């Protein structure tokens, strides 16, 4: 367990809240820099447009050459400096310091396993867990497709292919409902086809392999699995 006391939990939860305030202040600092740069851009747009609309008049009046040489020689360097200016040091410094108190990879895996143990103990469906349809979770937390994928991957590492299958199917389900996510169906189908084969369902593993190959026709292992499944089945 990552948490060694209630006070530790309280302190970290409050710290995260404070980090959101710090993040909002960073956003304001970037917005202010960007507003400055946009003003500068508009002015430069006007200046260059004004030159091309009367080129003979432009060269004919000497303030124009003087201002143009100075702008290119000097002003664009000032603008460059502003573009390069870092606005994130305050927020990043703060986050860096607070990370002293954060959990790490081992704690995140630990927490995933504890969720899986809960699911096993009470025989909870993946959909009930993901939608937060449990007392004390409802409207507090819900799982993304990528969270489902991660829990599936954790089960996979324990050789629990039963829960691998269930969680990968849940991920795939949410992707089909139209969830925008960083995980791709090909990754989910890779694990799902493998778990289903371990669970002794030959037909289903073949089918899932075919779905994968529809999305990624040159996936090497899936092509090999396709040939393998077909060979084994032809002999039964």
């Amino acid at each position: 367990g990552f948490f060694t006391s209630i006070g530790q939990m309280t302190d970290l939860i409050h710290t995260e809240k404070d980090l959101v305030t710090s993040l909002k202040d960073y956003i304001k600092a970037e917005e202010d820099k960007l507003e400055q740069i946009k003003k500068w851009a508009e002015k430069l747009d006007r200046l260059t447009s004004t030159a091309t609309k009367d080129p003979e008049g432009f060269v004919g009046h000497p303030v124009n050459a003087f201002k143009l040489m100075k702008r290119l020689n000097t002003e664009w360097s000032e603008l460059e400096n502003l573009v390069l200016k870092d606005m994130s040091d305050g927020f990043i410094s703060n986050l860096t310091i607070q990370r002293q108190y954060f959990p790490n990879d081992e704690d995140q895996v630990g927490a995933a396993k504890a969720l899986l143990r809960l699911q096993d103990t009470y025989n909870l469906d993946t959909d009930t867990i993901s939608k937060g349809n449990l007392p004390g979770v409802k409207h507090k937390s819900f799982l993304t497709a990528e969270d489902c994928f991660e829990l599936g991957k954790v089960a996979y590492t324990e050789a629990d292919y039963y829960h691998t299958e269930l969680w990968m199917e849940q991920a795939l389900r949410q992707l089909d409902e139209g969830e925008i996510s960083t995980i791709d169906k090909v990754s989910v189908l890779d694990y799902l086809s493998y778990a289903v084969y371990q669970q002794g369902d030959l037909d289903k593993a073949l089918l899932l392999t075919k779905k994968l190959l529809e999305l990624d026709p040159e996936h090497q292992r899936a092509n090999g699995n396709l040939k393998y499944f077909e060979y084994i089945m032809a002999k039964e």
């Binding site: 890779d190 694990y191 493998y194 292992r221 090999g224 077909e230 060979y231």
Partner: peptide, 9 residues
């Protein structure tokens, strides 16, 4: 002849 599935990922 084909080979049995390797680990995913």
């Amino acid at each position: 002849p084909p080979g049995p599935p390797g680990p995913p990922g």
